Amino acid sequence: MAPYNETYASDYAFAYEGMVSDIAPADIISRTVETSAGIGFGKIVAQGTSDRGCKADVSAVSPTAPPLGITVRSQATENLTLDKYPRYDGAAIMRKGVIWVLVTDAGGVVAGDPVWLKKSDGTFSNADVGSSGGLRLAGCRWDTSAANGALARMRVDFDVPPVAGA
Template identity: 40%
Template sequence: MAVNQDTYTDMLAPAYAGMVANGETSNRISRTCEDSAGIPFGVPVYRGAGDHGCTRTPNAFLLGITIAHEALGLLTGQTVDRYQQYDNVAILPLGVIWVVAGEAVTDGAPAYDTGSAIVDTVGSNTALTDWQFDITGANADLVKLSRR
């Protein structure tokens, strides 16, 4: 019989983008993905143009952070680790979730959306109202983001 895997890493990844971090009080909602390019896991999403829609494009109506979904079907040419257009998107508007830092971030700092990354620098970025980093991390690190 063939061996599928015979080597293992000593250090497993602690999480992945869009993974709910713990069992703290949280809330979950769902909306329909309006973006033709899809919406990645672990990113802020906003109210879309249609009823029950959501978009990755920052606007004044933050819905929450996308929750990863391990059982989505994937058609030829589609990208993994994202919701495709018209998929039902799971969103965390309250709780703690893992995301990828878009720069070095500090525990307790407020979070902002650049449109392509989550950072703790104000600048011209969109505020993720009431969301803050729950751990310090470097650029591209997995970090916890919380809204309590």
């Protein structure tokens, strides 16, 4: 009977942090979490050192060492970390479907835009940062107009090599 965090919303929300939207194709890949803390749901991941592991640290990704994919919302995750994949757990990375993610940009994004990754934190945006600290995920595009700090769905394809931007 818990009425806390009641906002009396006008209508239903759109999605959650890492939920997918149904479509026939999806590469979902099982990896093992390597970071000491968990990994959030809609997040980018790099290639681990365990030959099948992944890390949440993408500060050193390059066109030669591209990022691995994006985690998905699992909803059965050990109930000790709130919404995360705990250490030593199947990660369920996705690299082909359409997924809801979080926007980090001042002016927001619109339907068809490039997707730029900020290597410092691992956040998605519309344009390059400008100090050799951003990559462009070459095969990727948005699918929703959204403001700053809101959820937008994007279409992703990680087999296309990334592009470095200074």
